[PDB]
Write a protein that binds this ligand. Structure first.
Ligand code: HEC
Ligand code: HEC
Lengths: 108, 108
């Protein structure tokens, strides 16, 4: 990969403080500003049921794995030019590892 | 002060991942490598019952408040030359704010 597991506890709080404003991760969780992420891993971009993605996202056709996810989390708009997610990015790889460990775990 | 409250959720996980290895915060919690911190705020250094502090700590006679605590957390050994706490420090003020918000809350 390029990714190393971290703290899921740590990732849970990153999520609550940086992602929850626009996303849910729970099965049967609702779309909000952003789409619900439950089952995102191993899925391609733009396929959450009932959500209005931008063309950019859809077209990017990213297969979502832990590695991809890390790259995206660094600077989303640079990864998907045109995306409407208004999140500047997580620069430290340690923060990303934690968050993805948590997402890995909660989105399943 | 100089301190700003932050996320207690965030601080809880900082604690678990950076402080728990040697300290407890709960009332009736045990001394471990480091002393139990319950009721540390407004208390001076070296007065946890049953703990073997170094001379440095004791002599420092710091009155523990949120501000002091932030300074100490930056680089403990620079704050208390001679201290045996083997913790290099939390460089980002945001991390410290979070942790202290949590300690503020859990140590009472
Ligand atoms: C609102 C200000 C957001 C925050 C904060 C975060 N995200 Fe986001 N996300 C948001 C939108 C509006 C969208 C859709 C973008 C589009 O162009 O259609 C997204 C998208 C994602 C995706 C892609 C989803 C998919 O392909 O199914 C992921 C993986 C994602 N968001 C994750 C994520 C995380 C982990 C965040 C916290 C660090 C985060 N986002 C912040 C809106 C917002
Ligand atoms: C073990 C490797 C430690 C870690 C990790 C942390 N602390 Fe610590 N702490 C440790 C010791 C051995 C001691 C006693 C030092 C001495 O010289 O006698 C301390 C002391 C403190 C204090 C001062 C306590 C008092 O005056 O009553 C505080 C406020 C404190 N420790 C807090 C603290 C926090 C919040 C930590 C995580 C960021 C942390 N310590 C890490 C050992 C260890």
């Amino acid at each position: 990969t390029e990714f190393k597991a971290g703290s899921a506890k740590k990732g849970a709080t990153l999520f609550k403080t940086r992602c929850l404003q626009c996303h849910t991760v729970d099965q049967g969780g609702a779309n909000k500003v952003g789409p619900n992420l439950h089952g995102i891993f191993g899925r391609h971009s733009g396929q959450a049921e009932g959500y209005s993605y931008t063309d950019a996202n859809i077209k990017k056709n990213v297969l979502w794995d832990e590695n991809n996810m890390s790259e995206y989390l660094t600077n989303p708009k640079k990864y998907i030019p045109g995306t409407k997610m208004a999140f500047g990015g997580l620069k430290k790889e340690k923060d990303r590892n934690d968050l993805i460990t948590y997402l890995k775990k909660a989105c399943e």
